Every structure is written in C-alpha cells, then in structure tokens.
Amino acid sequence: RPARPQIDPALVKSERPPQTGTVFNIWYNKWSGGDREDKYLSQTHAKGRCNIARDSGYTRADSRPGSYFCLYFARGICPKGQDCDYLHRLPTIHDIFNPNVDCFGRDKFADYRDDMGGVGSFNRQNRTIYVGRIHVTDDIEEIVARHFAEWGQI
RNA sequence: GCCCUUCGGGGCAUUUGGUCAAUUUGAAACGAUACAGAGAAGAUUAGCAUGGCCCCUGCACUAAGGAUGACACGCUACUCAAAGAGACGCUACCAAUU
C-alpha cells in the first residue's frame, strides 16, 4: 500500500512561535525581552500520532536501498505520504544502524543532553527509554504495556 | 531526438545534490525582580602592570577602555637531627600509744 498523508500542509505551514517577548530575534529565531519561567513550564501536547495499520506504508525510501525512517512519520506529523524520502515503518529486528547515526538519520553524540533528551550517545548503547509524567492509577502497567507493545518489541 | 550510412550499421549528448519546507528534547541573550555590594597595613583614592582552562567593547591578533576590567587575600609536618643530663625505667613494697 502507498503511504498515506497523516495531516495536511495547510496546517503544516511554517510560521513563528507565539509571541513571548518584546522583539523577535531573527538570528536565533526566538522571542526576546520576556522571561525565563514561561519557557521552563511550557511543554505542550503533541499535535499528532501515527498508526502502523492505518499510516505505515510504502514510499520512495522503500524504493531506495539504505535510507532512514521518517522522524515526522514517527511523530505523526508527516503530511508527505508516498512522496516522503524516508521510511514510513517501524524498524524490525533486522534494522540495525551504525553508532554514529540513529534510525532517523540524525547524528548521535559523544555525550548526552543534561536532561537526557534528544538523539542519544554512541558512548553508551542505550535501549532504555524513561517515560515520566504519568497519571498514577492502578491500570498504568496495562496501559504502558499496551502502548509500548504497539510501538515495538520489548 | 537529430544526423550519417557501404542499408549491415555507426554517430551526437553522460551520473545533480545544500540532512527534508516541520522551532517542545542537541543547546541565543538581556532586561525586570530579588538580593547584596567598589584596591593599596587610619580616612578618601590617580593609576600602570603581572599570570591564563576569565573574558567583554574595539579594525587594532603590535591602540585604548572595561572598578587600576575582574580573579589574587585560602592553605601551611615530611631531603631533617645531634650532643649530655636525668629516669623505685626493666623489681619489690617492709613489726607499739602506756
């Protein structure tokens, strides 16, 4: 099957972040003249999610050997569909990558970010993710097992 | 596509490239607010330096300035004795008012 579009470019137009400052800095593309606390607490919800059955399909990266997965397909915000140049698929066990890059083609680092976010490190072969800010109920183990079993092999 | 042909064939032209167009998690920085708060053995302070895993402004990486730009002010045995003079040191502990 062809890769379906997940959202549309009418809402994947490119535009500024909302104004949190006196003046927009065009070098760093950030707002200035404001505060620091706002940035710390602001962590919004994701604008999409992807489906293996509904969204994952074939593309020009399935045509081209030795290419990477689509990061925006992983985030569920890939409006490209079949015309994306990166795979719309979960990696299998036969999908291995060199230490210098990750599965999305982004370069890995010698270190970690000090909040352990981002791409990762080739100085540690880490296969363990850390999922915080979970609402504490009793079915949390069932919910985590279901969703991450949907996201891969554990 | 064009050209040539002796109608079999042959020629002309030949491998681009900038990680996607997507801003939370691969790195911008002030200001406001809070707080404190300026060297030289009394008080007040003109400065010029020194050293670099501290830099900023500047064309100056052969000016100048930035509080003399700041930092400096903790800590503190270790190449290490000798002479002569002592030692109930190294063991025991001991029998009359009238």
Question: How many C-beta neighbours within 10 Å does residue A150 have?
Answer: 11
Q: Which two tokens stand for residue A145?
A: 């097992």
Strand B–CB A71 distance below 7 A: yes
Q: Alpha-carbon distance A103 to A118, whole Å?
A: 13
Method underlying the structure: cryo-EM
Q: Do A17 and A39 contact (CB within 8 A), yes or no?
A: no
**A68 CA to B19 C1', in Å?**
11
Q: Do A88 and A3 contact (CB within 8 A), yes or no?
A: yes
Strand B interface, A 93-152, C-beta < 7 A: 105-109, 111-115, 117-121
Beta strands in chain A (DSSP E): 23-25, 30-32
By C1' distance from the Cα of A108, the closest nucleotide is: B26
Q: Do A1 and A88 contact (CB within 8 A), yes or no?
A: no
Strand B–CB A72 distance below 7 A: yes
Which nucleotides in chain B have some atom under 7 angstroms from a protein Cβ? Answer: 19-32
**A125 CA to B86 C1', in Å?**
76
Question: How many C-beta neighbours within 10 Å does residue A82 have?
Answer: 15
User: Can you say whether the dihedral through the CA atoms of A68, A74, A77, A81 is positive or negative?
Assistant: positive
Kindly list the distances between the CA atom of residue A6 and the CA atoms of A92, A111, A146, in Å, as whole numbers in the listed order. 22, 33, 22
**Structure's resolution in angstroms:** 2.8
